[PDB]
RNA sequence: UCGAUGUCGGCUCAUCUCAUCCUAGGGCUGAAGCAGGUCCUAAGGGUAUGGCUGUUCGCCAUUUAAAGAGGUACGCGAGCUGGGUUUAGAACGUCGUGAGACAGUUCGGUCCCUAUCUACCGUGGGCGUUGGAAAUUUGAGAGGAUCUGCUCCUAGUACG
RNA sequence: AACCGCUGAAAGCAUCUAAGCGGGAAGCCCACCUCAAGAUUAGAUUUCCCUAAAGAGCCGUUGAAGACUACGACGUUGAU
């Protein structure tokens, strides 16, 4: 259930022979230098910690830098962790690599990212309510989020009310997209879907939890 | 205030509250509840020796 | 009555009582139970008597089927307990084959079912089911749920049925 | 089953069962005579 | 003569160990309530924290009579509309063990700052050990 | 409550109950099968669009797995509407000598408030977390989500 | 859960129940997704630093980040 850390090239498709477009996003895909191993000893749980990218040295803290240091590492743009179990762990030992070949054609993967940002949105795009008249004497409602309760009981608004607020720019997870073609050399993953976030996001590719 | 602490004091020398005062008004002891907790508080064996007393009365 | 009558042991069966787990041995197999608290067991020459320790109705009760089940399991492990069931219908049929028997009722798939360890099913023909086990409870409960499957029907009789179960039958199209 | 307030015996196959602190009519001739209380 | 209070800098609070074991969960609460409120001392004033460090050791294996291990139920809110959860004593016991003798004592001790300040005194640990060694905690059967 | 707690209906947005409309599990059946009926369990989700009328409702058309019954100031006008009712104009029928009147009708007829506090939706600042710091995190807990048709096949088999 | 049991006494029988052992729902608790240590019980792990350090911020160039913020990137050892 280890994973692997890539960046978001954008979207194409894929031909098949018997004449069906797939639409597919590239995913760009450097070694994943594992950083540190997290064990039911140590850490009470399991786990792999992998950098991946290039972080330059005005930019690596003295803290970090020793951190990749004593896993023989050099520095990534960010550091992510996988929840692994005994299985998962077998071969990986800090210092090593994890690339494309994770990952097979034809397996179901899940990929996390972070969703666009829309900003401030009101109700109307947020959570898809109904708009209010656009004539008939409305007066200056026609976006308006309309009632928000009720009366003396409860007196109150509930907890979790849909509301006006940031959307987007938040962790999304799109699960059972499928690998279309995977290249180690060109540190490529050729995803079947539309995976969140904007080209040149981080993007996070895991085995399947449905399956 | 000195109920509770009257209490406090029998109960650590094996009485509770509502025994030892039948015992003082038994043996026609006339302290007050205020001096009683004062001694409980501040002079443990004076009130381990009063404890007997009223102990000794039942 | 059931607890003042005394469990009577044949020749091979022996039963210890060791801290409430009493364990019947015989040449059928092991058996074991757990004697329940307000029970006292005594042996004697070749007789087990139970006994309320406190006397109750409850403790009564209680050393009732303390009695009950430990005359059941010297004649299990003795004699052993035999179940048997019947399959009617036309594409009935019933395959044992080890600890596990496939049955053919009438569905789009057999269903497989796995006895308990203490059972152990035969089919001299296809479709009846003889089930011999060391304990009534164990060969009572993979009757149950093998009769569970498919249990018979009232219009036509058909499913899986006890050997010595009457089942009533409705008429169809009484007008 | 029939659930009701009023449960007794329709035959002389009829038999009161508690189980659970409720009572129950089983009935082993009539299966429309089972009866619940509630 | 003046009545005193214990001024705060001045009380010691001593550490004893309670085996719940096979205990019954109300009547171990109220005695566990006690010492930690300090009932037990003859210097008592309302106001100040006297009480003892109780240690419970074992709290899994508290007693309750009667139907009450199926049908004692445990609610809670969560602020959200509808949001009223119920769990068991025994699924509770199974789930945070601590929390029954917990909850069995909050109820039990006063509902203020000082309430909370003495509920601290209470160290729970289901199983037989408890990481107090160094305290070094006396036996009290209570 | 008259030193003012804005009516009905719609729109928007809800929230809870279960006496359940669908879906789920059951007993009985005057349950052959398919369909049902009745009752028990069950509130997780779901639970139409139009014509008419101000309607709520209701009738009807066409669907749907279903088109639930209710509570929430007959939920919701400091969120919208303003068609009905309930000002001042006018007319008809009716009553009254008349001024006028009518849970009779008819045509027309100003809907304010920049949000302090609680609540809620988002998003920050402070301090704390037993020296400080850069990261990575476990999860006590909380929220979301939970629907369902049809076709094929088993099999035109079981049943009739 | 309803419901259906197995064995079984009270109550020589019977009996799903009193002891004991099963099955069983879109419901409950997990599992999935998101958030989550102000969980003041404030947790853990790895590194770095302490006669102004390790770092953080101001400032600048900014961004599919954004009301302001915050968050992300970069500042000549540089493609912001």
Known sequence: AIGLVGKKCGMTRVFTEAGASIPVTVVEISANRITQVKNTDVDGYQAIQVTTGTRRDSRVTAAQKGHFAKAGVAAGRGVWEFRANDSDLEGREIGGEILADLFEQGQMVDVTGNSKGKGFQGGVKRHNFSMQDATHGNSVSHRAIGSTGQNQSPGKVFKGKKM????????????????????????????????????????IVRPSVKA | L????????????????????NGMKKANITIDRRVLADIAMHDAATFGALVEKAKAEL | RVAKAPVT???????????????????????????????????????????????????????????????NYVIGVTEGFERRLQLIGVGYRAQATGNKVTLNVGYSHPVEYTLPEGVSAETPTQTEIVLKSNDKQQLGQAAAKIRGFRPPEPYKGKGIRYSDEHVIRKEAKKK | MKVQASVKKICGSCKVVRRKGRVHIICTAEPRHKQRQG | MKTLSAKPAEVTHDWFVVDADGKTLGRLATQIASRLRGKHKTNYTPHVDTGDFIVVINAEKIAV?????????????????????????????????????????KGMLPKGPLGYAMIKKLKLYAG?????????????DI
């Open chain 5, 65 to 105: 009579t009667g139907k009450k291990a199926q049908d004692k139920k445990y609610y809670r809110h969560s602020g959200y509309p509808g949001g009223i959860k119920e769990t068991n004593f025994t699924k509770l016991i199974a789930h945070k063990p601590e929390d029954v003798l917990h909850k069995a004592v």
């Open chain 1, 164 to 203: 006006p607020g940031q959307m987007g720019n938040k962790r999304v997870t799109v699960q059972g997209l499928e690998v279309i073609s995977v290249d180690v050399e060109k540190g490529l993953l050729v995803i079947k879907g539309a995976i969140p976030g904007a080209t040149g996001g981080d993007v």
């Open chain 3, 9 to 71: 042991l044949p020749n091979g069966v022996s039963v210890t009582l060791n801290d409430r787990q009493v364990e019947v041995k015989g040449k059928n197999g092991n058996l074991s139970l757990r004697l329940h608290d307000l029970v006292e067991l005594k042996q004697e020459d070749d007789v087990v008597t139970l006994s309320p320790t406190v006397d109750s109705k409850e403790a009564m009760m209680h050393t009732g089927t303390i009695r009950a089940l430990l005359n």
């Open chain 2, 2 to 21: 000195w109920i509770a602490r009257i209490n406090a004091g029998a109960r650590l020398n094996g009485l509770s509250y509502s025994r030892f005062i």
């Open chain 5, 128 to 140: 037989t050990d408890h990481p107090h060694e160094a305290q070094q905690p006396k036996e009290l």
